[PDB]
Amino acid sequence: WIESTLTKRECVHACFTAYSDVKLQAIEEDAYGVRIKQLLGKGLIKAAVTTGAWILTRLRRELEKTINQQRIHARIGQGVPVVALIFEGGPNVILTVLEYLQVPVVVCEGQSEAVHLFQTMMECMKKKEDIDVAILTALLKGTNASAFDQLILTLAWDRVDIAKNHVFVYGQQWLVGSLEQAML
């Protein structure tokens, strides 16, 4: 969990460590903390750098998720997508956060019995375990969302490698228009 994700990132009223406290290891405010070791360790790093995520590592936490997901991107209708990574005990990678400086959102806010909590709220796709980079972000293309929205999620990210392999699969059945709109 928290000790494993911090060792991954290290290997690659206000307080500052050198009641909300920033840091200056889980640098709260990236990680807003509230073989297989380096694959699950170095996989979510390449999944969190290329999208600019908030790794989370309980009521304030779930309120922060259900209010973080109701946010809007720049030109995109959808909300910030939340993934539960319960492989290491519950880290919850939020895929495209708003790069905040240290918080008004937070003002406005075993584990196998916590898997089932997520699957009754909207979706909250849970990945529990191929590369951990593309599985963690490609877990969001498994709900009932439209193929166009699966493209715009990849387009808010910088990730072409998902969009070729998992959004332009043969037999995708695109709409006759609106691929023109993602072109816009």
First CA to last CA distance, the chain:
41
- Residue written as tokens 């969009």? 163
- Cβ pair 21, 14 in contact under 8 A: yes
Q: What does DSSP say about strands 21-23 and 15-17: parallel, antiparallel, or unpaired?
A: parallel
Chain-centroid distance of CA 5 in Å reads 14
DSSP notation for 114-159: THHHHTTSS---EE----HHHHHHHGGGGSS--HHHHHHHHHHTT-
Angstrom distance (rounded) from CA 68 to CA 61: 10
The vertex-117 CA angle with 114 and 123, nearest 5°, equals 125
Separation between Cα atoms, residue 68 and residue 54, nearest integer Å: 10
Which pair of structure tokens corresponds to residue 143?
Answer: 């709900």
Give resolution, Å, one decimal: 3.3
What residue type is 80 in one-letter code?
Answer: V
In this structure, how many other beta carbons lie within 10 angstroms of the beta carbon of residue 46? 16
